[PDB]
Design a protein around this nucleic acid. Structure first.
Ligand SMILES: [Zn+2]
Lengths: 59, 112, 48, 118
RNA sequence: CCCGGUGGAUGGGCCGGGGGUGUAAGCGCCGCGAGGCGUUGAGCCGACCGGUCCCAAUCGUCCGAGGUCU
RNA sequence: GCCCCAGGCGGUAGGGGAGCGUUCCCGAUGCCGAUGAAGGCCGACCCGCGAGGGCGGCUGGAGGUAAGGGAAGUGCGAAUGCCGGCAUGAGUAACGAUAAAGAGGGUGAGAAUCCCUCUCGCCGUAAGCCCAAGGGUUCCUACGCAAUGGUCGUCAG
RNA sequence: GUGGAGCCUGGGAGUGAGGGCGCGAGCGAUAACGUCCGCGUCCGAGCGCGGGAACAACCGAGACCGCCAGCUAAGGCCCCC
RNA sequence: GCUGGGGCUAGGAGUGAAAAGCUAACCGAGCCCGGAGAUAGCUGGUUCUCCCCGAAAUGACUUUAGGGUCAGCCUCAGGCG
RNA sequence: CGUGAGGGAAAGGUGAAAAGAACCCCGGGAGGGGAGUGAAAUAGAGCCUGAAACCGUGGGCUUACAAGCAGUCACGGCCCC
RNA sequence: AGAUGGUAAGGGCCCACGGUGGAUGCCUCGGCACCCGAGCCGAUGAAGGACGUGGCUACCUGCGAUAAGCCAGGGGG
C-alpha cells in the first residue's frame, strides 16, 4: 500500500453526476384507518395508537 | 403571494440537509409535513420547523389560505463554517469545517 | 513515552527564575532584552 | 454464506447474545410489553415462546429448565402462575411483534414492541 | 432476483418425523461415602423434513394505456 | 509633393521606436459631483491596432479630477511563490481498544446517550483507596445548552 | 550589381549545450536518432501553412490583416477525401 | 540492578561499557539572536499593448569546459557612398 | 508557540442620529415573518460598498450509439431581443 | 417495410436571483520618514513590575492601604 491518491480534482459535472443516485425516496405513508392520519404502513399509528383495527399502544 | 421562513445559521451540513429539502420542493403543505415527520434524517427536523414556521408566516403575517399552501420553492444556502481541529496521527492536525446552513422555504397558494 | 517536558516548579524557578537570570551577566542581558521587547512575562511564571 | 443458517448474530458475541435473550425475556415477563429494535424482537419471539411453552408444561423439570435461563425465583413464579394459565389453551404465538412508526432518534434505528399475547 | 400478501403456510411458534447428544431431573433402592442400580434410549434438542393460522405478512398508497407519421 | 510612388512587414535571445493603464505632485482657493463621485455588476453601443477610453443601464452612497507635464513601491499565472478564502478526495476513511450491554420509569420541546430501578458483563497487586509531583478552581450548588465533548446530549472537567 | 547592401565611429546585446538532412572525411564495425570536423541548408527562432496518415529540420513554400475570388507548387484526381 | 528527589558537567564543548550515540522529538558538531539581505559561476520566477530589425550555440585563452574576456554573428545612432 | 534564550499572530468601518427593532405570530430557544425606527434594514449589529473562487434556486437551449486540450469555422434548429 | 423526434436520473452552457467571502473604492482615533525642540533617570530607592484600590469590576487607564486617589497654587467656568 503506497497511499493511493486522487489524481485530479473532480470536475463539478462529474461530482454532481456521481451524486445523481443520491436522491431520497419519500417515506411512503398510508392514512391511519382510525384517525385518518398518514403514517408508514405495517406499523402502529402513533396518533391513534391502534393497529389492525384495535388498540396496541397508549398514545 | 409567497410566504417565506429561513433557518439562518443552522449548525448542520448543508449538503446533507439539501437532500431533505429537495424532497419537499413542489409539494403540498400537508404532504411536506407528513413527509418530514417520517423521514429518517436529522435535517428533516430543521426543515420541519422552518416549514411550519413558514406556514405561520403565510397565515398570520401574509394572510394566505393555508389550504392552497404548497412549497413553492425551498433551498439551503451554506453558512459560515466553524473551523475546528481534528488531531491526526503523527503530530499533524486537520481542520474540520463544522458547517452551518441557512434554510429557505417559500410558500404559494396552488390554484385549481 | 516519557516526553521532554517533565514539569517541576523548583527546577523551573532555580533554572529560569528571575534571580536565576539576575545572578549572571548573560541572564541580565536577557532581562534587558525582555524589558526592551516589552514582554509582559519578564520571566516564566511559577506558582508557590 | 448464510445458507439455511438460522439465527441473528446481532453484532454480539455468543454469551452476549445469550445474556441479551435472558435480559430481554426478563423485562418481557416483568412487563408484558417492551420496546426494542426490530431484529432483537424477531430474535426474541422463539426464545420467549419456548419459555412460555415450558410454562404450559409447568412441571418441576420445566421449572428448573426455564430457571436455567431466567435465573429468578420470583419472576419464574409469576411465569408459572400468571402466564402458564393464561396461555394454557394457546399453541404457539405466545408473543406479538408490532413495528412502531417512529424510529429511534439517537441512531435512526427502527423500533417495535414485543408484547405477551392477551 | 425469487417467493408469499387472508384465498396465506412466507417466516417465528407449536406439533410430528429426522438428527444429534446419550439414560434428564425427581424419586426409589444399594451402598459409611465417593458413587451404583431402576424408573430411562430418558431428557434436551440450531438450521433438517411436513402439518397446524397460535403469532406475525393489517389497512394501504402511488405510479402506470387513449397508441407519431408514409 | 496631409496625399500619392516604390518597396517591406515569421519571428526567440536580443536592440530600437511608439502608446495604454495604476498611485501620487503641478494645473487646482479651480472644475465634476445628492439631478449621485469612487467603487461593483452589465452592454449585442461608439472610439482605438492594442494596451485601453467613452457612453449607456442597475448597485453604490461621497468623493473624483482634465487638457499638458512630473515622479514612481506602476501592470502578475506561474517562483514545490506568501496571506486568506472556497473547493477536490467525499458524504468517503474515521469516530481512538472486542470490558457488553438490555428493559421499565422520569425528566424534558426534544432521549441509545441525562437521573432512578432492575437485569447483565469488566477490573479487583485494579480499571479500588491514600500521599507526593505536577495541574490550578477542573471541587459543591443553581441555572443554560451558542460552542466544546469525535454522535446526541435535558448532561458535563 | 541601390541592397534591411557595404564601410567607419560610437551605445546596447544575446550567444559561446546545438541539432537534423545532403555532400567530403576521421573515429566506430563503411553500427547507431553515435561522435568529430569542412561546405551547405533547415529547425532552433518558422511545433505558422500544404503534402508525406500521424512526425523540427523529407518535398512545397517564408504566415501584416480581411474576402463565401482566381492561378499554381510539392502531392494527388476509386470512397473516406 | 531499578527508581524518586536534591545538584553538577555544553557546544568543537559535556557525557559516552564507544554506536559517532545522546546532549529538549532530525547532533559527524544543539538552539536563539546577531554578522545577515553570508555566498550560490546553480534552480525557479520576473507582471500592459503595438511596431521595426533580428542572432548564436563558432574561434582563441581560461583551476576552464553548463561560467567567463576578445573576435564572429544582432540592433541602434551618426558619418562615408 | 518554545524548557528557555526566543519566535509571534490575526483582528478597523451600521447609522447623521441607536433612532439598535416595542409588540404579534412560528419556534424550546436560536432564527424567521410581520410591525416599527430609519433617507435607505440585502444599512440589523455575523452591520459602508461587497468582487472572484465556491455554493445552491428558478428559467432558455441542449444532452442517454457516444470519442474529447473542450475550442474554432460553416450550416441548421430552438429560444430571446 | 420504412423514418422520425421524443424522455433527463443527472449533467453542460447562458440568464435571473441568492448564500459564502472579504478584494476593491472611500475613510482613518495608527504608523513611516525628514526637520525643529529636548535630552539623562536612580539609595530621598530609579527604570520596570507583582499585588491591590471602584458600592457592584472581567480587563485597560489611574493611583497606592490616603490606592481612578489627598493638599496648596495657576488655568478654566
Ligand atoms: Zn390513528
Amino acid at each position: 500500500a503506497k497511499h493511493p491518491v486522487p489524481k485530479k480534482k473532480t470536475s463539478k459535472a462529474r461530482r454532481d453526476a456521481r451524486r445523481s443516485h443520491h436522491a431520497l425516496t419519500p417515506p411512503t405513508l398510508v392514512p391511519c384507518p382510525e384517525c385518518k392520519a398518514m403514517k408508514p404502513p405495517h406499523t402502529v399509528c402513533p396518533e391513534c395508537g391502534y393497529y389492525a383495527g384495535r388498540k396496541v399502544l397508549e398514545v | 403571494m409567497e410566504a417565506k421562513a429561513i433557518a439562518r445559521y443552522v449548525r448542520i451540513s448543508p449538503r446533507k440537509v439539501r437532500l431533505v429539502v429537495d424532497l419537499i420542493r413542489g409539494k403540498s403543505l400537508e404532504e411536506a409535513r407528513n413527509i418530514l415527520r417520517y423521514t429518517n434524517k436529522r435535517g428533516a427536523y430543521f426543515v420541519a420547523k422552518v416549514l411550519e414556521s413558514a406556514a405561520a408566516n403565510a397565515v398570520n403575517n401574509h394572510d394566505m389560505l393555508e389550504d392552497r399552501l404548497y412549497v413553492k420553492a425551498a433551498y439551503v444556502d451554506e453558512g459560515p463554517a466553524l473551523k475546528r481541529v481534528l488531531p491526526r496521527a503523527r503530530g499533524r492536525a486537520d481542520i474540520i469545517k463544522k458547517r452551518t446552513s441557512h434554510i429557505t422555504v417559500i410558500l404559494g397558494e396552488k390554484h385549481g | 513515552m516519557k516526553r521532554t517536558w517533565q514539569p517541576n516548579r523548583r527546577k523551573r524557578a532555580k533554572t529560569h527564575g528571575f534571580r536565576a537570570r539576575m545572578r549572571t551577566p548573560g541572564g541580565r542581558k536577557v532581562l534587558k532584552r525582555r524589558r526592551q521587547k516589552g514582554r509582559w512575562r519578564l520571566t516564566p511564571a511559577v506558582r508557590k | 454464506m448464510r445458507h439455511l443458517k438460522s439465527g441473528r448474530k446481532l453484532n454480539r458475541h455468543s454469551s452476549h447474545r445469550l445474556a441479551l435473550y435472558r435480559n430481554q425475556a426478563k423485562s418481557l415477563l416483568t412487563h408484558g410489553r417492551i420496546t426494542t429494535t426490530v431484529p432483537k424482537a424477531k430474535e426474541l419471539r422463539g426464545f420467549v415462546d419456548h419459555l412460555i411453552h415450558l410454562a404450559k408444561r409447568g412441571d418441576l423439570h420445566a421449572r428448573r429448565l426455564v430457571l436455567r435461563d431466567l435465573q429468578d425465583v420470583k419472576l419464574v413464579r409469576k411465569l408459572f402462575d400468571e402466564i402458564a394459565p393464561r396461555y394454557r389453551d394457546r399453541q404457539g404465538g405466545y408473543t406479538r411483534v408490532l413495528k412502531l412508526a417512529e424510529r429511534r432518534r439517537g441512531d435512526g434505528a427502527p423500533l417495535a414492541l414485543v408484547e405477551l399475547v392477551e
